[PDB]
């Protein structure tokens with residue numbers, strides 16, 4: 133059956149069997165703890181079709197992670213504004229970060245992926261050669277010892293949490309190789325089913341395609357594991373509309389040239405083919 | 420119906436559909452990537468019944484983690500020898516720890532859980548007040564903000580990996596509160612289905628009982644998530660024997676006095692009630 137049906141069944145399960153659970157943002161949710169889905173990456177790319185997903189946002193956000201950036205405004209220069217609210221003067225002030233520049237998210241994904249364990253200063257600092265380049269380590273291990281059971285990139289850093297504008301929603305991922313295929317599992321501690329989760333699915337599928345490309349492997353599965361999987365109260369009616377829509381076959385992702393290192397990928401290297409979504413569904417972000 | 424059927428079905432699935440995957444130990448495995456099970460902790464305790472599980476081992480190992488120990492000899496002194504092989508002279512030497520005293524596992528679970536980010540020296544150093552006490556922070560957060568979606572204890576420490584005799588198998592866990600119940604999800608990167616996994620299920624169920632007790636909550640679910648779930652080749656025959664056995668109702672776990680802090684729990688504080696396992700099944704550990 134269509135892989136998108138897993139996402140839709142998760143949404144329906146939360147609507148039907150989820151518990152009312154208040155949250156940080158003051159919005160309110162319906163919530164379930166503990167879910168898992170498996171999205172095949174084999175000649176298909178799991179960009180949801182039951183609404184038009186902002187693929188440019190997914191793509192730019194991942195390249196921004198990869199380059200090690202923790203500056204929301206670097207992403208905003210690309211017309212991708214998704215991290216502006218959590219980097220705003222008001223939001224940073226609400227957390228007591230009145231001294232740092234607007235857009236400075238702290239030692240979040242980019243910094244942990246490429247410099248885990250280095251001493252964070254600000255978003256502009258030069259961290260070259262400092263900390264653990266987990267992303268490069270993952271790639272190197274896949275190339276040289278693919279049976280390894282420790283192929284992990286972890287953005288969760290207990291020491292640095294107090295400095296983060298938002299601790300990583302996508303906390304840890306693990307890679308796996310068998311039969312010439314590269315799979316990835318994400319541990320996502322917290323999943324906004326309406327906004328974040330469709331992005332997260334596409335983002336880690338894309339990352340897996342990227343790493344598969346540079347390691348000469350074929351993409352296998354993306355296994356999506358959720359902790360607190362929730363529907364914000366103001367997404368209930370939009371999601372009930374979405375749930376009635378028939379998925380279209382997933383698109384394909386093409387990489388348009390041979391790229392040798394993870395740092396060399398550019399937006400122009402990717403083409404989504406055969407993407408036929410239902411119309412955009414508006415959903416407001418909980419700050 | 421019976422929660423143990425999930426474990427048995429996972430084992431059966433790996434036997435039937437798992438792929439042959441070579442491994443670090445040289446033993447070989449049948450392997451699947453990405454599994455999830457949910458063990459209820461409500462008025463019962465998921466200590467497997469299709470073989471007799473070494474409960475004293477589970478209990479002493481967890482208390483050893485909680486006290487921050489990284490010395491296998493301190494666990495061995497309790498009659499629990501399960502960590503001895505990975506702290507042995509030959510094993511340490513194989514990894515390059517030629518000057519390290521036998522028993523010194525490096526900065527593994529106990530250290531990461533109570534002192535994340537501290538500078539490891541050796542297993543006999545005093546780390547009091549150094550690093551992040553993740554376990555106490557989990558407890559405090561459950562008490563002060565049970566809705567929090569960041570209640571995580573993570574042993575995975577990229578910076579410390581090179582010093583570890585064995586990187587954490589149980590890599591990260593997350594706690595969750597709803598309906599007066601405390602639930603726990605474990606992200607286990609690597610699961611030895613025959614030996615480790617039955618211990619891991621009981622261990623995290625036990626930790627959840629302990630924290631629920633301290634925080635005035637009822638145990639909810641233990642959600643078990645696996646990365647590389649595998650059966651060692653020399654466990655195939657023993658597990659096939661196990662698969663022929665019908666589970667008995669799970670036992671209960673009783674806590675025998677009011678305990679106020681996680682560090683005050685002692686072996687004598689616990690009673691497994693109504694445990695009726697099938698006979699012990701011997702399985703050899705892959706070093």
Ligand SMILES: *C1=[C@](F)([C]N2[C]([C][N]C3=[C][C]=C(C(=O)[N][C]([C][C]C([O])=O)C([O])=O)[C]=[C]3)[C][N]C3=C2C(=O)[N]C([N])=N3)C(=O)[N]C(=O)N1[C]1[C][C]([O])[C]([C]OP([O])([O])=O)O1
Nearest residue numbers: 156184185186214301302322323324327328329417418568
């Ligand atoms: C988290 C995370 F990180 C995410 N996120 C971020 C941001 N992002 C975003 C934003 C916005 C958006 C939008 O808007 N979008 C679009 C539509 C859709 C499509 O198409 O796709 C447009 O606009 O167009 C997007 C994205 C940060 N923050 C946040 C987020 C989300 O999602 N949500 C919110 N509310 N916020 C990830 O990654 N994921 C997820 O899921 N996340 C979440 C979870 C929760 O809810 C939150 C956090 O909180 P805590 O409390 O848990 O910490 O988030």
Ligand SMILES: CN1c2c(nc(N)[nH]c2=O)NC[C@@H]1CNc1ccc(C(=O)N[C@@H](CCC(=O)O)C(=O)O)cc1
Nearest residue numbers: 473501502505588611614615616618700702704705706
């Ligand atoms: C999770 N661990 C683990 C590992 N290595 C492997 N291959 N598998 C594992 O599960 N290294 C580190 C740690 C060691 N834990 C363990 C846990 C149990 C046993 C074991 O031998 N248990 C037997 C008998 C124990 C007894 O009764 O004395 C059992 O039947 O459970 C060994 C190592």
Ligand SMILES: *c1c(F)c(=O)[nH]c(=O)n1[C@H]1C[C@H](O)[C@@H](COP(=O)(O)O)O1
Nearest residue numbers: 281443586588589609610611615616619
């Ligand atoms: C290790 C443990 F410590 C544990 O708690 N549970 C486990 O299941 N294991 C297993 C997993 C694997 O068989 C070995 C560790 O080997 P690597 O994955 O590090 O090669 O022990």
